[PDB]
């Protein structure tokens, strides 16, 4: 249901990120583990402290996954086919956790992009993140 | 908090519930309707087909134990957090179970009680049981950190 | 997505309903108002007591809406196009309430179909009811 | 339940918060990101464009009021059930507002606070604010 205005806002907002994707992904992950501790059950025996290379490593992976999703906004189901299969049959993360990570991504973008986080871009990014979560949960059942 | 009439209606129905067989039905239907909850039972065998889940013997054993602790919580409806305090710490610190699975299991159990009792599972009885499964799910997630 | 086994199970399950759809819709609504009283905010001047013609009238409308969805399972976005517009731009019902009605519909079906509410049909109906909610909420934003 | 270090950092951030401007910004963004929440504010006027929503005078004049229970919960930390015993009856027995919209506003308020404060809205500061918006929303929905 992504509108052409949404694609323009998401591309412009994520375009300002650029090389800061790996740092923003690690920040949004730490925000999720702190605000929603129930999400930590999916990363057992992981180093979840601040400045952890384990957290910073996975933060770049999710960021590169979102970077590929923005470039393939019109081909999102086929671009995230490897991740949708992994999250559905291997990780089996409950779909309620996707809303928690999507919310922390919006908070990270708002805190880091003060000029680009307009109410129009805010609504566009929330719809885009909801579409990515729906794609990653489409192959669950 | 439940009213005496609500506590009596929930207790009366449980007096007719066979914890052994019903436990294996709720856990089985939970793994079938929501297949992402199978990540904790890889050692149980094969759970690819519904008949395999409802036919798994290890699933029926865990279902009786799960609903067995649920049966003990019904006798202490005024203190579910303290009753499930030890189980909440184990599911979190040792089992790493997502507390959302407690809400999915509560939804399945309401459907199992309706499928087994039929017209006896009246809308007022369901509303009384909706608060029970919500309290047990929150009590089992209270000790999560 | 809905699998051919799901379409077969939902068609077989709803086929046993038949002329009891209008009565079952009023039961699932009463179960929703009793179990989740927050849903009553969307029917402010409805008579919600037992045996209310307003509940049985709207219960048949929702049942007839689901009946049309089963016959057009492969074309559900088209069949519910008129209803998605009403719930999105006129009713503005929060999408979290659709999961409550879908759950109460499953409870009503289980209580009335003892020989047919198999775990396979249970999983098939939950996916189908989740698809009805997704279609009715697609035009929200 | 919040720690004294959590309550101290949250109250310190709220001291620099303009309840008038932040309330009108959070209430307006909620109507833009979640347009189905406009059912209760049909009398507010032009809600078609995001610029018309943020610039709507009735939106800003009521944003300072909607943020009250968040400001009220920031003083009566915990025991919010007795604190929110009359505001629920207003939004329930009179306007019949879905309590889920209160949860959306809490998450929107977190985004507004992060956008207003930037790095000052640290992940620990956000986590403490999430407990506040979760307790207030659950207390407001307990009387429904
Ligand atoms: C937009 C949402 C999400 C995106 C884009 C995303 C992306 C990714 C990526 C790229 C990987 C690495 C896959 C690989 O290296 O093969 C991954 C792994 C993983 N994800 Fe996600 N993910 C999302 C949501 C979530 C959420 C919300 C959770 C948990 C609450 C989660 C739990 C995991 C876990 C446990 C792993 C495996 C970590 C490991 O084994 O190192 N994912 N995800
Ligand atoms: C009302 C809800 C539940 C109750 C009362 C309950 C109760 C129990 C009990 C009594 C045990 C055994 C503890 C011991 O060994 O002393 C247990 C273990 C366990 N629980 Fe639950 N449980 C519930 C829900 C769930 C759900 C929904 C899941 C996952 C979807 C789950 C996953 C597990 C697992 C994996 C074990 C370990 C089994 C084993 O290794 O033998 N529990 N639970
Ligand atoms: C299974 C999903 C649902 C279906 C198939 C459905 C279908 C319908 C239908 C057919 C109508 C009548 C439209 C007309 O007569 O013009 C209607 C109206 C309405 N629906 Fe739904 N609905 C669903 C979910 C919900 C939910 C969860 C709510 C929130 C509690 C809701 C709230 C309403 C309201 C308030 C009306 C207007 C009632 C009236 O004015 O008489 N709907 N819906
Ligand atoms: C969560 C804490 C909230 C607080 C403390 C609050 C506060 C207030 C106050 C002070 C009034 C006016 C009192 C009066 O004139 O009698 C009011 C009315 C109103 N509230 Fe809320 N509100 C809250 C949440 C909400 C929510 C979640 C909604 C909608 C989903 C909402 C929508 C309205 C509307 C439309 C009015 C009527 C406006 C008017 O009559 O001028 N409020 N609220």
What is the SS3 assignment for chain C?
A: CCCHHHHHHHHHHHHHHHHHHHHHHHHHHHHHHHHCHHHHHHCCCCCCCCCCHHHHHHHHHHHHHHHHHHHCCCCHHHHCHHHHHHHHHHHCCCCHHHHHHHHHHHHHHHHHCCCCCCHHHHHHHHHHHHHHHHHHCCCCC
Q: Which two tokens stand for residue D53?
A: 């929503």
CA torsion angle D3 D4 D6 D10 (round to 10): 140
By CB neighbour count within 10 A (0-12 exposed, 13-18 middle, 19+ buried), where does D25 fall? buried
Please, which residues have CB within 8 angstroms of residue C137's CB and are 6 or more apart in sequence? C84, C87, C88, C95, C98
Q: Is the Cβ of C141 closer than 8 Å to some Cβ of chain A?
A: yes
By what technique were these coordinates determined?
X-ray
Q: Is the Cβ of B136 closer than 8 Å to some Cβ of chain A?
A: no
Rounded CA gap, C96 and C107, in Å? 18
CA distances from D126 to A103, C67, D115 (A): 11, 46, 12
User: Using a CB-CB distance cutoff of 8 angstroms, which residues of chain B are in contact with residue A140?
Assistant: 35-36
| Tokens 């606070």 -> residue | D113
Check if A46 has its Cβ closer than 6 Å to any atom of ligand 1. Answer: no
Check if D101 has its Cβ closer than 6 Å to any atom of ligand 4. Answer: yes
| Tokens 């992402």 -> residue | B36
Q: Which two tokens stand for residue D22?
A: 């932040």
CB-CB contact of C114 with C106 (8 Å): no
CATH of segment(s) B4-140? 1.10.490.10
Rounded CA gap, A12 and D104, in Å? 25
Nearest protein Cα to ligand 2, atom 28 = B101
CB-CB contact of A94 with B36 (8 Å): yes
Phi, psi of B122 (to 5 degrees): -70, 160
* C-beta contacts of B77-84 below 8 A and 24+ residues apart: B77/B2, B77/B7, B77/B10, B77/B132, B77/B135, B78/B1, B80/B135, B80/B136, B80/B138, B80/B139, B81/B138, B81/B139, B81/B142, B83/B139, B84/B136, B84/B139, B84/B140, B84/B142
CATH of segment(s) D4-141? 1.10.490.10
Rounded CA gap, B60 and C24, in Å? 32
Dihedral (CA of B14, B18, B20, B21) sign: negative
Q: Which two tokens stand for residue D50?
A: 């995001």
Rounded CA gap, B125 and C5, in Å? 33
Check if D140 has its Cβ closer than 6 Å to any atom of ligand 4. Answer: yes
Q: Is the Cβ of B99 closer than 8 Å to some Cβ of chain A?
A: yes
Could you tell me which chains touch chain D, where touching means 3 or more CB pairs under 8 A? A, C
Q: Please report, in range form, the residues annotated as the binding site of B for heme b.
A: 62, 91
The closest alpha carbon to D140, from D91, D77, D72, belongs to D91
Q: Between B and C, how many CB-CB pairs are < 8 A? A: 59
Q: Show which residues on chain C lie within 8 Å of chain D, measured between beta carbons.
A: 37-38, 40-42, 44, 88, 91-97, 140-141
| Tokens 């402010």 -> residue | C44
Domain range list for chain A: 1-141
| Tokens 């009735």 -> residue | D58
Rounded CA gap, C63 and C49, in Å? 19
Written as one string, the DSSP assignment of B108-129 is: HHHHHHHHHHGGGS-HHHHHHH
Distance from CA of A69 to the nearest CA of D (A): 21
- Characterize B52-90 residue by residue with b for buried, 16 or more Cβ atoms within 10 angstroms of its Cβ, and e for exposed: bbbebeebbebbbebbebbeebbeebeebbebbeebbbe
* C-beta contacts of C51-55 below 8 A and 24+ residues apart: C55/C26, C55/C29, C55/C30
Q: Which two tokens stand for residue D65?
A: 């009021």
User: Closest chain B residue to C26 measured between Cα atoms?
Assistant: B123
Rounded CA gap, A114 and D115, in Å? 6
The closest alpha carbon to C26, from C101, C85, C95, belongs to C101
CB-CB contact of D78 with D104 (8 Å): no
Q: How far is the CA of B66 from the centre of ligand 2 (A)?
A: 6
CB-CB contact of B22 with B60 (8 Å): no
By CB neighbour count within 10 A (0-12 exposed, 13-18 middle, 19+ buried), where does D88 fall? buried
Partner-chain contact D36 C42, CB within 8 Å: no
CB-CB contact of C140 with D35 (8 Å): yes
Rounded CA gap, B88 and B63, in Å? 17
CB-CB contact of C120 with B32 (8 Å): yes
For domain C1-141, which CATH number applies: 1.10.490.10, 3.40.640.10, 3.40.50.720, 3.60.40.10?
1.10.490.10
CA C121 and chain centroid, separation = 15
Rounded CA gap, A25 and A78, in Å? 22
The closest alpha carbon to D54, from D22, D18, D28, D26, belongs to D28
Q: Is the Cβ of B107 closer than 8 Å to some Cβ of chain C?
A: yes
Roughly how many angstroms between the first and final C-alpha of chain A, as a whole number? 22
Please, which residues have CB within 8 angstroms of residue C54's CB and are 6 or more apart in sequence? C46, C47, C48
* C-beta contacts of D96-99 below 8 A and 24+ residues apart: D96/C40, D96/C41, D96/C42, D96/C44, D97/C41, D97/D40, D98/C38, D98/C41, D98/C42, D98/C94, D98/C97, D99/C38, D99/D137, D99/D140, D99/D141, D99/D144
Partner-chain contact B145 A37, CB within 8 Å: yes
Q: For chain A, how big is the Rg over CA atoms in Å?
A: 14
Ligand approaching nearest to the C-alpha of C98 = 3
Angle separating helix axes B100-117 and B19-33, nearest 10 degrees:
120
User: Phi/psi zone of residue C50: left (φ > 0), alpha (ψ -120 to 50 degrees), beta?
Assistant: beta
Distance from CA of B74 to the nearest CA of C (A): 19
Rounded CA gap, A73 and C129, in Å? 28
Nearest protein Cα to ligand 2, atom 1 = B70
| Tokens 């999983």 -> residue | C123
Mutation pick for ligand 2 pocket among B44, B62, B68 (CB with most ligand atoms within 8 Å): B62
| Tokens 């927050």 -> residue | C38
* C-beta contacts of B116-121 below 8 A and 24+ residues apart: B116/B17, B116/B22, B116/B25, B116/C114, B117/B13, B117/B16, B117/C111, B118/C111, B118/C112, B118/C114, B119/C111, B120/B13, B121/B13, B121/C107, B121/C111
Neighbours of C132 (CB within 10 A): 21
Say which of B36, B37, B98 has its CB closest to residue A38.
Answer: B98
Q: For chain C, how big is the Rg over CA atoms in Å?
A: 14
User: Using a CB-CB distance cutoff of 8 angstroms, which residues of chain A are in contact with residue B38?
Assistant: 92
- Rounded (5°) CA angle B11-B17-B19: 110
Q: Which two tokens stand for residue B86?
A: 């030890």
- The H-or-E segment that residue A44 falls in is none
Say which of C34, C110, C114 has its CB closest to residue B111.
Answer: C110
CA distances from C17 to B114, C57, C112, D79 (A): 16, 17, 9, 48
CB-CB contact of B14 with B129 (8 Å): no
Angle separating helix axes A21-35 and A96-112, nearest 10 degrees:
120
Domain range list for chain B: 4-140
Q: Which two tokens stand for residue D128?
A: 């403490």
Roughly how many angstroms between the first and final C-alpha of chain D, as a whole number? 23
Check if A70 has its Cβ closer than 6 Å to any atom of ligand 1. Answer: no
Partner-chain contact C127 A138, CB within 8 Å: no
By CB neighbour count within 10 A (0-12 exposed, 13-18 middle, 19+ buried), where does B115 fall? buried
Distance from CA of A89 to the nearest CA of D (A): 30
Rounded CA gap, D67 and D27, in Å? 8
């Amino acid at each position: 249901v992504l509108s052409p205005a949404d694609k323009t806002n998401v591309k412009a907002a994520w375009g300002k990120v650029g090389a800061h994707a790996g740092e923003y992904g690690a920040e949004a992950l730490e925000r999720m583990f702190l605000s929603f501790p129930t999400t930590k059950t999916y990363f057992p025996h992981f180093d979840l402290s601040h400045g952890s290379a384990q957290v910073k490593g996975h933060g770049k992976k999710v960021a590169d996954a979102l970077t590929n999703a923005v470039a393939h906004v019109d081909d999102m189901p086929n671009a995230l086919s490897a991740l949708s299969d992994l999250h559905a049959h291997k990780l089996r993360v409950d779909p309620v956790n996707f809303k928690l990570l999507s919310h922390c991504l919006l908070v990270t973008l708002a805190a880091h992009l003060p000029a680009e986080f307009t109410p129009a871009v805010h609504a566009s990014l929330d719809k885009f993140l909801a579409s990515v979560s729906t794609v990653l949960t489409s192959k669950y059942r | 908090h439940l009213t005496p009439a609500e506590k009596s209606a929930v207790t009366a129905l449980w007096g007719k519930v066979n914890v052994d067989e019903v436990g294996g039905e709720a856990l089985g239907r939970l793994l079938v309707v929501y297949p992402w909850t199978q990540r904790f039972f890889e050692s149980f065998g094969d759970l690819s087909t519904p008949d395999a889940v409802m036919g798994n013997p290890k699933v029926k054993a865990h279902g009786k134990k799960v609903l067995g602790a649920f049966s003990d919580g019904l006798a202490h409806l005024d203190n579910l957090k303290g009753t499930f305090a030890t189980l909440s710490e184990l599911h979190c610190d040792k089992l790493h179970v997502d507390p959302e699975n407690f809400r999915l299991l509560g939804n399945v159990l309401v459907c199992v009680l309706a499928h087994h009792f039929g017209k006896e599972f009246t809308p007022p009885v369901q509303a009384a049981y909706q608060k029970v499964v919500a309290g047990v799910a929150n009590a089992l997630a209270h000790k999560y950190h």
